[PDB]
Amino acid sequence: RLEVEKDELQAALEEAEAALEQEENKVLRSQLELSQVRQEIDRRIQEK
Amino acid sequence: RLEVEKDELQAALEEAEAALEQEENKVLRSQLELSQVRQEIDRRIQEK
């Protein structure tokens, strides 16, 4: 009866550590755009 | 033996890795606001 919750909490951390990973991907993303916006502002001004 | 390793594992995932997520959700949301602030650099090329 204690084991069924022991596999529950172990899975929840594996549920967490996946779900904790995706912000670490996400926090790179807007960093990855904001590094690149020096390029597009000189490209769009060429259009206008 | 199983009971002590249960709660010490539960001492992490219920509290720490749960709070580790919400600590990063601020860093997720604090940066996403900065993206729309960065879009006001694209406001300047509309001013020209």
Q: Write down how many β-strands of chain A occur, each being a DSSP E stretch of 2 or more residues.
A: 0
> Rg of chain A to the nearest angstrom?
21 Å
Shape of chain A: rod-shaped
End-to-end CA span of chain A: 69 Å
Oligomer: part of a larger assembly
**Hey, which two chains have the biggest interface?**
A-B, 24 and 25 residues
SS-based structural class of chain A?
Answer: mainly alpha
Which band does the percent of strand residues of chain A land in? under 5%
| Percent in helix of chain A | over 70%
User: What composes the largest sheet of chain A?
Assistant: none
- Helical segment tally of chain A? 3
Instruction: Please write the string of helix (H) and strand (E) elements of chain A.
Output: HHH
PDB class: motor protein
Keywords: striated muscle, asynchronous flight muscle, motor protein
Entry title: Lethocerus Myosin II complete coiled-coil domain resolved in its native environment
Chains A, B: Myosin heavy chain isoform Mhc_X1
Structural summary, described in words:
The structure is cut from a larger assembly and holds two copies of chain A (48 residues). The first copy, chain A, contains three helices and no strands. The first copy, chain A, is rod-shaped and about 70 Å long. By secondary structure, chain A is an all-alpha fold. In chain A, 88% of the residues lie in helices and 0% in strands. The longest helix of chain A is centred in the first third of the chain and has 17 residues, at 3-19. At the A-B interface, helix 1, helix 2 and helix 3 of A face helix 1 and helix 2 of B.
